[PDB]
Design an enzyme around this catalytic site. Sequence first.
Site, short mmCIF file in Angstrom:
data_model
loop_
_atom_site.label_atom_id
_atom_site.label_comp_id
_atom_site.label_asym_id
_atom_site.label_seq_id
_atom_site.Cartn_x
_atom_site.Cartn_y
_atom_site.Cartn_z
N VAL A 81 -2.15 -8.95 3.74
CA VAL A 81 -2.19 -9.74 2.50
C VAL A 81 -2.83 -8.86 1.42
O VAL A 81 -3.93 -8.30 1.62
CB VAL A 81 -2.99 -11.06 2.69
CG1 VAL A 81 -3.46 -11.62 1.36
CG2 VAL A 81 -2.15 -12.10 3.45
N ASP A 99 3.83 0.86 0.60
CA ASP A 99 3.95 0.38 1.97
C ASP A 99 4.46 1.38 3.03
O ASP A 99 5.66 1.46 3.33
CB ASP A 99 4.70 -0.94 2.04
CG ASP A 99 4.25 -1.79 3.22
OD1 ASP A 99 3.93 -1.21 4.30
OD2 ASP A 99 4.21 -3.03 3.07
N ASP A 116 11.34 2.00 5.13
CA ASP A 116 11.36 0.65 4.54
C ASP A 116 11.40 0.64 3.00
O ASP A 116 10.69 -0.14 2.33
CB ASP A 116 10.22 -0.22 5.11
CG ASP A 116 10.53 -1.74 5.06
OD1 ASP A 116 11.71 -2.14 4.97
OD2 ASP A 116 9.56 -2.52 5.10
N1 LIG Z 1 3.00 -3.55 0.21
C1 LIG Z 1 2.11 -2.90 -0.41
N2 LIG Z 1 1.42 -1.87 0.11
C2 LIG Z 1 0.53 -1.34 -0.73
O1 LIG Z 1 -0.20 -0.40 -0.45
C3 LIG Z 1 0.53 -1.99 -1.97
C4 LIG Z 1 -0.27 -1.68 -3.00
C5 LIG Z 1 -0.10 -2.40 -4.28
C6 LIG Z 1 -0.71 -2.12 -5.50
C7 LIG Z 1 -0.24 -3.05 -6.43
C8 LIG Z 1 0.66 -3.87 -5.76
C9 LIG Z 1 1.47 -5.00 -6.32
C10 LIG Z 1 2.60 -5.41 -5.62
C11 LIG Z 1 3.37 -6.45 -6.09
C12 LIG Z 1 3.02 -7.11 -7.26
S1 LIG Z 1 4.04 -8.45 -7.78
N3 LIG Z 1 4.61 -9.10 -6.44
O2 LIG Z 1 5.07 -7.91 -8.60
O3 LIG Z 1 3.22 -9.36 -8.50
C13 LIG Z 1 1.87 -6.73 -7.96
C14 LIG Z 1 1.45 -7.45 -9.23
F1 LIG Z 1 0.68 -6.64 -9.96
F2 LIG Z 1 2.52 -7.79 -9.94
F3 LIG Z 1 0.76 -8.54 -8.93
C15 LIG Z 1 1.10 -5.67 -7.49
O4 LIG Z 1 0.74 -3.46 -4.47
S2 LIG Z 1 1.66 -3.21 -1.98
#
Ligand SMILES: N=C1NC(=O)/C(=C/c2ccc(-c3ccc(S(N)(=O)=O)c(C(F)(F)F)c3)o2)S1
Lengths: 257, 296
Positions: B17, B145, B127
């Site tokens: 999460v 990821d 992925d």
């Molecule tokens: N699956 C993942 N693995 C990581 O290391 C990740 C790091 C990370 C940094 C910022 C985000 C991230 C991803 C989606 C989103 S999203 N779903 O677009 O809302 C956001 C946000 F800023 F916009 F909220 C931020 O993920 S995400």
Amino acid sequence: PDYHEDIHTYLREMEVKCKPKVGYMKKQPDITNSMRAILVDWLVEVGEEYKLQNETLHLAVNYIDRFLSSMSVLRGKLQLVGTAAMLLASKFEEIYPPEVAEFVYITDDTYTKKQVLRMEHLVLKVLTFDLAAPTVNQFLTQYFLHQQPANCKVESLAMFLGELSLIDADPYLKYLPSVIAGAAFHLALYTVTGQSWPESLIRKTGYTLESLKPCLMDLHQTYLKAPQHAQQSIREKYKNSKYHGVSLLNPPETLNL
Amino acid sequence: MENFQKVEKIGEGTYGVVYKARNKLTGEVVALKKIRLDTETEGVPSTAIREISLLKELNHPNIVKLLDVIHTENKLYLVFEFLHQDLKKFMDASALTGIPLPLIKSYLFQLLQGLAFCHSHRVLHRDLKPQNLLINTEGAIKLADFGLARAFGVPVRTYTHEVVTLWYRAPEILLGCKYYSTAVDIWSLGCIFAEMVTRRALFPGDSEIDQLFRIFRTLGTPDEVVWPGVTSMPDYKPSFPKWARQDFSKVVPPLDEDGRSLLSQMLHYDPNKRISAKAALAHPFFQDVTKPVPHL
Ligand SMILES: N=C1NC(=O)/C(=C/c2ccc(-c3ccc(S(N)(=O)=O)c(C(F)(F)F)c3)o2)S1
């Protein structure tokens, strides 16, 4: 293919950053080279028992030596360090790592699940999560691409020899993975076919036959002495038909160097 | 870990999460990936072990930056640089207007840069889908990821078969090939490229056979000329309908001659003939390339 040269170049960088301190055993007050030998031989058996990749073994040995480079360990905890290292290597390398419960069972309840899980966290802490280390194996697989045609006995023999070097920290901690792999390839090639370290590999590795001589001197000795050695699991492993029974082959009596 | 003030859950990115959080002392905005260790389980998950070790040596401007690893007995946190949104959401927001092509071109160029860095450091992502690709306000896009990622060897061994999100999954995985390598990631990027262009997913299957057939329907069912050995693959069936290849002018209409060239090279059936991320960077499609900013 497209990346072979870049990867080699980069593995060559990493092996130097990933190497253990060469004389760390002299600064260990309880544990010895003979004890580390017995442990590595044991892990050979564990890997045979769980059908683990040779690579997983090589990684585990790297993690153990790096751990012991900075951490004093009492003899009664050496096997715990080895087991958590085998666990980490497996999680890293294997499609299906054995479960902690099986790791606990192959130590015959010498340690608890908790103890294995707590050692796992310590090893990761001490290694700062730097688990992706070059091994003799990884160099050997690349070097195999330079034999024409592909000879399976040479390949099984080079691996057999590469694995023998894992047991004996004196002298093999002195040598980088790419060097032991070159010495092992040459020795295997020479024994099976009479050929020598190929020109294509002198070019790729920048290692002349001469430069490989100190490690080859050692490894020839280790080969000659192999049926007399106190640790015997690698020789047993390498009798089986999947390895063309190469541990049963006669070593060459002289190298001509 | 009491230096962080949580701001919001920004998803469940796969096996963790993810939260938005702020460093209370420096003010830095970070992403936290919480990975619980239950109790008396299997230890640190093999996906966290891989993700951390691989990321520690994937330092590139087009790869998400791991800033810290907070390592308790009870919990494991990964601390990442924070980026604004993922590409899936950016694409959904642009479903009406369309992503401008200089930016499609910028994003792909960057993705290929980050990916070539992975490959030349012996890493397979495994992925690449729009939701695992992150963008910032200044026009950067990054690979994220690395939970499903793997350090590979030369030559490769057999690795896990259950790999790649179905829509972005390469034919050589679907046909049950013994070996796959870096080409599975190029495949995924080609699908993402197409998806940025046409605003919808190139091959949105619902089962493996359905994913395959959609692939066959677009690019033609592969034969021995197109792909030596196909008819010998574990899950190949000589009963497969033999569909002819669709002209890329219908497949991906908004794209120029250079665009189609690259895409067809990323979607080559033969993994050995499929373009590398390094060779892709040298393609004429990128002669023109700039660093535009996203339009939210
Ligand atoms: N699956 C993942 N693995 C990581 O290391 C990740 C790091 C990370 C940094 C910022 C985000 C991230 C991803 C989606 C989103 S999203 N779903 O677009 O809302 C956001 C946000 F800023 F916009 F909220 C931020 O993920 S995400």
